[PDB]
Amino acid sequence: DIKLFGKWSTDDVQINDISLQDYIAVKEKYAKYLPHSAGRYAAKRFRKAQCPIVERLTNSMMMHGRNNGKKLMTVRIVKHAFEIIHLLTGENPLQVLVNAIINSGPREDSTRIGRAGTVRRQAVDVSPLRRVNQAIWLLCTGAREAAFRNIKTIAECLADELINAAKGSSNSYAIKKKDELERVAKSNR
Amino acid sequence: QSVQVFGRKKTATAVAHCKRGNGLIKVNGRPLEMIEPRTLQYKLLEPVLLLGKERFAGVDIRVRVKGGGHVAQIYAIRQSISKALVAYYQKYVDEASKKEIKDILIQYDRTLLVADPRRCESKKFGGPGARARYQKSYR
Amino acid sequence: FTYRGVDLDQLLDMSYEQLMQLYSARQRRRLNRGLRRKQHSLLKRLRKAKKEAPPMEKPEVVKTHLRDMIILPEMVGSMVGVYNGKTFNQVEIKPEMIGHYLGEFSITYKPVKHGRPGIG
Amino acid sequence: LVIPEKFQHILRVLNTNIDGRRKIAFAITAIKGVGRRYAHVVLRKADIDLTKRAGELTEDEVERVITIMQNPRQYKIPDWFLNRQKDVKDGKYSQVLANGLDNKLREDLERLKKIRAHRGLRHFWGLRVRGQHTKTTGRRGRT
C-alpha cells in the first residue's frame, strides 16, 4: 500500500544481519511515501533508531557548508539515485540500501589513549547503532568526495557507490575505510 | 452542515472548509496536484492516499493558507485536511467512523492531528544567533 | 591642442551654460549648483593679476585656500598657490588640467619612505 | 548537428589567437575590450544564432561581426555600451579593442603624469589609487 516515491515497495526487502535488525528501519510500519517527515527524532537518546533510514541517508547527504539546510535538494538526489540503482542492477532499490548499510560499518574500532602527541590506542567493540551511524557517513562522504571536481553528478556518484558497497567491492570509498579501520584495530587487539 | 478547522506549523495557518460536496479538494482555489513544491506532492496527498477517495467523496475542501514558507505550508495544509475530515465525521457522522479514521491517521504520523509546537528561539547579544557565540581570541 | 574635440580658443569664449556640456558629471553638477560668493572673487583676482601682468611675463603667484575650485578654461596660465594644510604650494595652470580640482596639486602629505621596524 | 568539416579551429582576429571550439558568444570575449556582455549585443545586431560554435561560421558572418566592432554606431548600438564614451581629446564615442587598449590607457595614465596630479603620481608610485586603506592590505608582491 505504501511505496517510497510512489513506486518502490518494501515487502521484499530482507535485512541479513541480526545485529542491525532492531535498528535499521523500514520493513513493516516505517514505510513512508517520502523521506521528508520533519519529526523530532533528536528529542531523546535512541529515538532516531525509529526513523526511516531513507531519511537518515537524506539527512547525512547535506553535510557540507553550502548545502546545510537544503532538504528538498537532497531528497531529489536520493530519488534520482533510486532510478540509477534500479537500472544498473534490476531489482528493488531498497534491498541494496540495507545491503550497503550492513556491509559498510566497522565492527571493531580503536579508542585513543595517550599523552600530548603520544598515541597508544586499543581495540574495542562497535555498537551496532554506531555501525549504522558510521555506515551512512562513509557512504555519503564517498559520494561527496568522488563527485567534487568531476563531470559525474551526485546522483550517479551516490548510486555507483551504493551498489559497490552492497557488492563488497574495494573500489567503493566506504569499504576502503572499514577494512582499514579494522586493520589498524587488529594491529593492537 | 459545514466545518472550519485550522492546521498549523511554525507560522503557517491553513484553514480548511469542509461542506457536503463531491470531492474537489482545492488549495487557495487550485488543485492539490498543481501546488508548487511538487517534490512534496505525496506529503500533500497522504490523507487521501491513506483513507481512499471514498471517505472523501462526500466532502468539498477549499483550503486557504497564509504565513510561513513552502515546506511549512505543506505541513499545515495536510494537517488541516485531516483535522477537517475528522471534525466532519464527528459532527455529521458517528464516533465510530471518527475512531476508524483517527487510528489510521495517528498510526501513519501523529503530526496529522497534533500541532508541532516548536518555534524559533531568540537571538542573544554575544553571538550570531540563539545558541552560537562569537569567536574569541587570546592575549 | 583640444578638449572633447574643440580647441582652447573657442573655450575662452565658450559660454557658461554651454561649457557645462563638455565637463564630467561632478563638474557639470558643480556648475549647475553654482559657483559661490568666494569663488567669483577668485576669478576676479586672476583677471586682476592677468591684465596687469607684463605681456611677456606670467603673473605673480597668488595664494588661495580654495582647493575645491574647478580649473575653468578661462583660468589657464595663471600662477595660483593652493594650500596643503601647511604651506602654499606654487601651481602653474596648463591647458590639459581643465577638468580637475585645484586641490589635487598640493599634496597634503609626505610620501612615505620607511625605516627600520622597531618592536612590532 | 552533424559532423563539421570546414572547421577553422583558430580564428586570428585583431591580432588575437581566439578559440574556435568555444561558443560563438564566449569566443569573442577572449579579446581585450569585449566582455561577455558586448559580444552578445554585436552578435544579436549581426542577426546570427548563438547556438553555434566558432568554427562553422561562414566568412561573410566572420567579417561582418568584426566590421561592427570597428564602427558600432552605424548599427544602433547605443553610446552607453562603449569603452570610451566621451573622450578627453576628440570627444568621440568608440569601443577600444585589443590593439589600442594598452595604447590608450597608457596615454590616459601618462596624461595624468605630465600634469603631476594626485592620481597619476599615485599610479607612478604603484600604490592604490581609488582611496582604499593601505595599512593592512596590498602586501602581496610588495617589498
Next chain:
Amino acid sequence: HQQLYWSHPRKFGQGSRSCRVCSNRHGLIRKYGLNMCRQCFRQYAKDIGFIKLD
C-alpha cells in the same frame, strides 16, 4: 566677524545634534524623538517609562 563666526552650515551631520541633558554629541539616541545620550538615557529610563522586562 558678523558674517563670520557662527557661519558654517550646521544643517545636518554629527555636530548639529547634541544630547538634550548632557549637551554632548556622541552616542545619541534619536529614536522615537528621545534625543538623549546613550548614557543619560540609562539614568532616566525608568522615569520615562522604559521598563526592562526581558
Next chain:
Amino acid sequence: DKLNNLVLFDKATYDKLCKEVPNYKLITPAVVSERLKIRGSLARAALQELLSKGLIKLVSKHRAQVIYTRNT
C-alpha cells in the same frame, strides 16, 4: 590529466554513438562524456535526438539529471 574533448561530432565517434548507446541500460550525460570522450553539451543535445529516433526510452528528465535507458 587535463581533459581534451570534442565540441562537435567526429566521423568515428558518431559510429560509437549510434549502436552501443542503445545497448547500455543506463544512458546519462555524464557517462557518455566519460566513455566516448566528448564534452557535456554533445552528451546533453546529441542524446536528445535519439528520443526522437524512437530508439532509447526516456526514464526521468530533470534540470540536473537526465536518465535514459534502452528499449526492451
Next chain:
RNA sequence: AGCGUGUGCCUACCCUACGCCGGCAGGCGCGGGUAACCCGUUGAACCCCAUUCGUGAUGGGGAUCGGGGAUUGCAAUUAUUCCCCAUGAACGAGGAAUUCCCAGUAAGUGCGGGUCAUAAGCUUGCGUUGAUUAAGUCCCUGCCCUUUGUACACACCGCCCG
C-alpha cells in the same frame, strides 16, 4: 514570511502607492499615511521548475584599474555612495595552532532597527529552510567541597641555596 520603522521643541532631515520620460542609477507631477485606516496581502532571498554551460584558472572568482552618467551636500579631488561598458589578479579547500555549539540547535538565506544630509562587509533583533553527533567523563583546561603537607601569607608570579 516575521520582528519593525515612518512627516521631528530647537531641527534642516520620510515611509512612500500611481501615471509619464529614461537601458539603468534616477527625473518630473500627483495622491495616501502622526498610522491594525497608507506604503502593505509588507507579491524577500535561498528553496522549487525549465534552457544554456561542461572539469579548464572555464562563463567559478571578483580584486585592481580606464572612460562616461546620476543622485546627497555649502564642499565629493586622497575615488561619499549609486548606475553602464571594459580590465579580469590571488585563490585548486588551507601547516603549527585555535573558536563556537545539544533541537526548530548548528549552518545556509534574506529582512528590519541603531548609526543615517549621503551610507552597513558592523552590531542588534526577526523570520524562512533546516541537520549530523551526545544524553557521557574528569584525560586536558579550569571551578568547587572534604581529609593534609607546608620554614608560603605587599600568599608558587611564593619562600630560598650555592
